[PDB]
């Protein structure tokens, strides 16, 4: 009947003679009460993916922003965005009321991440995380933490860990949440008692909670386009200047900045030249989802484009 298999101490597969995998199993057993043989059975099926390793290693004016923008802001995407917003309008409104994060932002994030559930990833999360945890020294500690959390997530949401698919880095569902984001920020927004990253309502609430947790200020401006050029100052989402310094550099805001006394200097390559912007706190909050000026601007503008297409 019950097969303890205490003597089955050597698992097979791609991670068979991997010390990192052995240490990881020990940690799960010691810290979380996992069973060594059960975990060995799961990991013996995990695959070491060369592609996952290659991709993690891989990471004017010439119209740079224009090229990035058109990857996301197209008639098909805007139209699908309108369909998603209308379909989940109650959840979006509820997220706005509870977290202070507007529908255009949530719709923009989910659109850029997975085209509203159409492209959620084809790689088994277990394979990606095991590969990065056991055969990638550079970020092994980070990924081992993600694998630990993933296995705990599967246990708690009662998922077979081998059945879940996602990105080459282990990101999941509509919002491409990493396991650590599920742990710290995902919420049961549907009200069914579970937190399902593949449930659009749970994903909407989870993205909203992630935003509020990272400082989203309800009703505050994201960024304000500037008139003028500031070629002498370094730019990017990580920069920080007083409004006074930006003025001395030749900039004026197109919309009043209210009480904001500092801003990042964003510069978008529009082909014919450069378009400068005053980046406000909420813009930086968007970059907390993906550290990129282009990403945050695409998320924001896609959401704006969808909001406008809904009005028509
Ligand atoms: Na739920």
Q: Which domains does the chain have, with CATH numbers?
A: 12-59+122-186 (1.10.8.350), 60-118+199-312 (1.10.530.10)
Distance 209 CA to ligand 1 centre (A): 14
Handedness of CA 247, 249, 255, 261 (dihedral sign): negative
Resolution in A: 1.7
**216 touches 285 (CB < 8 A):** yes
Which residue stretches of the chain are H helix?
Answer: 19-32, 36-43, 50-57, 64-69, 75-87, 89-99, 103-114, 125-134, 140-156, 179-185, 200-213, 243-248, 281-287, 293-311
Q: Is 146 a residue of the active site? A: no
Taking the C-alpha atoms of residue 48 and residue 36, their distance in angstroms, rounded to an integer, is: 20
What's 243-254 look like in SS3?
HHHHHHCCCEEC
199 C-alpha vs ligand 1 centroid, how far in Å?
A: 7
User: Ligand 1 centroid vs 90 CA: distance in angstroms?
Assistant: 15
CA distances to 33, 43, 146, 168, 205 from 18, rounded to whole Å, are: 22, 11, 18, 21, 39
SS3 label, residue 48: coil
- Please, are residues 302 and 113 in contact by the beta-carbon 8 Å criterion? no
Residue of 104, 113, 146, 148 marked active site: 113
Q: Distance (Å, rounded) from C-alpha 250 to C-alpha 232?
A: 10
Ligand 1 centroid from CA 196, angstroms:
6
Which residues fall inside 5 Å of ion ligand 1, going by CB?
188, 190, 192, 194, 202
Determination technique for this entry: X-ray
């Amino acid at each position: 009947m019950v097969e303890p298999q205490h003597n089955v101490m050597q698992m097979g597969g791609d991670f068979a003679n991997n010390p990192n995998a052995q240490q990881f199993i020990d940690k799960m057993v010691n810290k979380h009460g996992f069973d060594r043989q059960q975990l060995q059975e799961i990991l013996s099926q995990a695959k070491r993916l060369d592609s996952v390793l290659r991709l993690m290693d891989n990471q004017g004016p010439n119209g740079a922003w224009l090229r990035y923008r058109k990857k996301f802001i197209t008639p098909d995407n805007v139209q699908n965005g309108v369909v998603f917003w209308n379909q989940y309008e109650d959840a979006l409104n509820r997220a706005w009321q509870v977290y202070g994060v507007p529908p255009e932002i949530i719709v923009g994030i989910i659109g850029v991440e997975t085209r509203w559930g159409r492209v959620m990833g084809k790689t088994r999360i277990l394979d990606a995380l095991a590969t990065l945890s056991f055969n990638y020294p550079r970020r092994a500690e980070y990924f081992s933490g993600e694998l630990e959390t993933f296995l705990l997530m599967a246990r708690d949401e009662q998922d077979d860990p081998l059945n879940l698919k996602g990105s080459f880095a282990g990101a999941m569902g509509y919002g491409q949440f990493m396991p650590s984001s599920y742990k710290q920020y995902a919420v049961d927004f549907s009200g069914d008692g579970h937190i399902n990253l593949w449930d659009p309502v749970d994903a909407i609430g989870s993205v909203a909670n992630y935003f509020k947790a990272h400082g989203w200020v309800k009703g505050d401006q994201v960024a304000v386009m500037a008139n003028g050029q500031a070629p002498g100052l370094p730019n990017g989402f990580k920069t920080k200047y007083s409004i006074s310094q930006l003025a001395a550099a030749g900039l004026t805001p197109q919309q009043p900045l209210g009480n904001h006394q500092q801003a990042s200097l964003l510069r978008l390559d529009v082909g014919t030249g450069y378009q400068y912007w005053y980046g406000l706190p909420n813009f930086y909050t968007i970059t907390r989802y993906n550290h990129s000026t282009h990403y945050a601007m695409a998320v924001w503008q896609l959401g704006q484009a969808v909001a406008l297409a809904r009005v028509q």
